[PDB]
Write a protein that binds this DNA or RNA. Structure first.
Ligand code: FDJ
Ligand code: CL
Ligand code: CL
Ligand code: MG
Ligand code: NA
Ligand code: NA
Length: 326
DNA sequence: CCGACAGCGCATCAGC
DNA sequence: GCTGATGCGC
DNA sequence: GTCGG
């Protein structure tokens, strides 16, 4: 990409803040500046040029100047020399291994991919699966494969009940050419806001996708969220597709637009939009938008008939999913 | 000069 | 086993 | 680490 060196540097700094420092706001800060720079259709030539962009303040500006001048950041080279941090940075790339498990592993002398394989009895189920598919889960999903997965999922939910609705969200719905996982929003006029004629709806759908061997593994399961692993069928004589992460969310119908807003993101967009909602006197979660009182108590859920209605309350112009790629 | 920084679902662990 | 906190991931 | 107040 055009400013790929700068956004790589910021992402590496961000990974350090998340994985090692656990400095969440510094993580998001590096991450926000990385987002707006990758989006800027111009070759950044100095830190001052970048300091014109939102999210880029003094210290990211200075780090841009250092990186432009040298190809490097001393901070990053020092982190890369730190064995504990670097081991932690690697181990947190396994799905299910965060900073706590990472440094637990490192103190146990477990710090490599093959260390993990030798001590698999030390991993919980999520971590075992993350290790099993580690190479797979480093691979992104071409949009063309996302279309095939979408075809399978949307038809299968119709097979369980023809009035299920399934919307593939996340980066795919913002039009990305590749995606990290598959995010499937699901609902049914049976299910309205927690007035349940009887649940088990998500399990029914998961059952069916397991039955056709699309879902191959389970990471988490509740009444509203399933996390697991799935795989496209291969044709005879031919290399398997990589296994893929999948998240399916079952949401009440009267909450569909909040659900699809949230599940479409991006995460930075969601954080920004939700912050502006607080500034305007509302709170937005995946289910509802509510008013806030002076003392902060949330009101009752507001009517929503579209994504645009949510933008209207907080006095934003509607943004197509493709322009929410923050 | 400093405090805010989104909001949630599910799994597991520590202590009882 | 439960509560409540922590961990990890959308 | 940035931003807004
Ligand atoms: C991680 C995260 C996600 N979301 C919402 C917004 C997200 O859009 C939605 C999907 O989460 P995802 O992790 O799959 O994000 P994505 O956009 O699909 C990624 Cl670019 P990729 O999967 O293609 O690699 O969940 C949040 O609201 N807060 C969050 O902290
Ligand atoms: Cl570097
Ligand atoms: Cl709610
Ligand atoms: Mg996704
Ligand atoms: Na991970
Ligand atoms: Na996801």
């Amino acid at each position: 990409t055009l400013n790929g060196g700068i956004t790589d540097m910021l992402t590496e700094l961000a990974n350090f803040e998340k994985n090692v420092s656990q400095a969440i706001h510094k993580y998001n800060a590096y991450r926000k500046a990385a987002s707006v720079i990758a989006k800027y259709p111009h070759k950044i030539k100095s830190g001052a040029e970048a300091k014109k962009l939102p999210g880029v303040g003094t210290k990211i500006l200075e780090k841009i100047d250092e990186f432009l001048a040298t190809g490097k950041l001393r901070k990053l080279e020092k982190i890369r020399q730190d064995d504990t941090s670097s081991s932690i940075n690697f181990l947190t790339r396994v799905s299910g291994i965060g900073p706590s498990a990472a440094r637990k592993f490192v103190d146990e002398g477990i710090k490599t991919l093959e260390d993990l394989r030798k001590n698999e009895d030390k991993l919980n189920h999520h971590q075992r699966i993350g290790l099993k598919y580690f190479g797979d889960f480093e691979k992104r999903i071409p949009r063309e494969e996302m279309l095939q997965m979408q075809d399978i999922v949307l038809n299968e939910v119709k097979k369980v009940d023809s009035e299920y609705i399934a919307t593939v969200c996340g980066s795919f719905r913002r039009g990305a050419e590749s995606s990290g996982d598959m995010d499937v929003l699901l609902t049914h006029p049976s299910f309205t806001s927690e007035s349940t004629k009887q649940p088990k709806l998500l399990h029914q759908v998961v059952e069916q996708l397991q039955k056709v061997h699309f879902i191959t593994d389970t990471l988490s399961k509740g009444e509203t969220k399933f996390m697991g692993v799935c795989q496209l069928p291969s044709k005879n004589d031919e290399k398997e597709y990589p296994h893929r992460r999948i998240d399916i969310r079952l949401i009440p119908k009267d909450q569909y637009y909040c659900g699809v807003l949230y599940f479409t993101g991006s995460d930075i967009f969601n954080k920004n939009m939700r912050a502006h909602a607080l500034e305007k006197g509302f709170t937005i979660n995946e289910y509802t938008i509510r008013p806030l009182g002076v003392t902060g108590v949330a009101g009752e859920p507001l009517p929503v008939d579209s994504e645009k209605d949510i933008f209207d309350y907080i006095q934003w112009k509607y943004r197509e999913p493709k322009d929410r790629s923050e």
